[PDB]
Amino acid sequence: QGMFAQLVAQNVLLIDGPLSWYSDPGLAGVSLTGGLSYKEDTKELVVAKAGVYYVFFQLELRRVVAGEGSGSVSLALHLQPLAAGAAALALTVDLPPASSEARNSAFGFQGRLLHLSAGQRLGVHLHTEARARHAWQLTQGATVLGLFRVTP
């Protein structure tokens, strides 16, 4: 069983801060094989074996209050320990203002190759620049952090 993982976000409400993740592999859409594990206190995924990984996350939102809510939402992947500059993965999804043509969901996907060593911690932070934030929520099961090792 090669080194790979996929976590489904627990959060529904748009609040700035670290996302909490489902990590039990018995849950549909969640896989945590090898020596990989999840630190629930710090909300970080800890890497099992060193290598280069294809790391990706997915961001899907649904309008939960009809006719309300607009702005944008952002995810950032943070590595622990850190170089000094930048974030490893950044994805911004715009929420369309409510209109007759506007749909009530929004989606964004981004993927990257990342150097990860064993014992490295990966956290994701949610940021929101939205008006009437209550009108949008994270689509349950569709905000996902995944990674698999490409150096076999």
């Binding site: 489904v8 489902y22 018995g26 849950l27 209050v65 009108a135």
Partner: protein, 144 residues
């Protein structure tokens, strides 16, 4: 044969442990037997309230916080209770069609009074928000 077929609802057939069936993890459920995973429970937060809580065999169900109503099967999204001049349709709040009115929150559009049927004039025309105001007969001294 296949031992996963005997894992009941509330468990899943665990390919990660030595045991064959494991109870659903927290905040999850399996509504049928013989599943390889359990499904993450629906969470009802913000505008949503928890009408029925999640169990190991049954998904939670949401409704909308007071002053809002559900829209869509399974209460997919919430909508403010319709105001004066609209009525609730399956696709949300909709203006009253021409000739009908609704004067109150959470009402239904109904046609205007036809004063002409009772032989009365129209002093003030209605809108989607208000009924007509009929006057006296046209013949009545009010009309010269």
């Amino acid at each position: 044969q296949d031992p996963c077929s005997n894992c009941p609802a509330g468990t899943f057939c665990d390919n990660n442990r030595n045991q064959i069936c494991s109870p659903c993890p927290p905040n999850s459920f399996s509504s049928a037997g013989g599943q390889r995973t359990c499904d993450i429970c629906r969470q009802c937060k913000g505008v949503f309230r928890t009408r029925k809580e999640c169990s190991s065999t049954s998904n939670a169900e949401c409704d909308c916080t007071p002053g809002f109503h559900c829209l869509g099967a399974g209460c997919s999204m919430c909508e403010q209770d319709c105001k004066q001049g609209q009525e609730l349709t399956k696709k949300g709040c909709k203006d009253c069609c021409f000739g009908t009115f609704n004067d109150q929150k959470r009402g239904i559009c109904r046609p205007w009074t036809n004063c002409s049927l009772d032989g009365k004039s129209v002093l003030v025309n209605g809108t989607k928000e208000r009924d007509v105001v009929c006057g006296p007969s046209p013949e009545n001294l009010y009309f010269q």
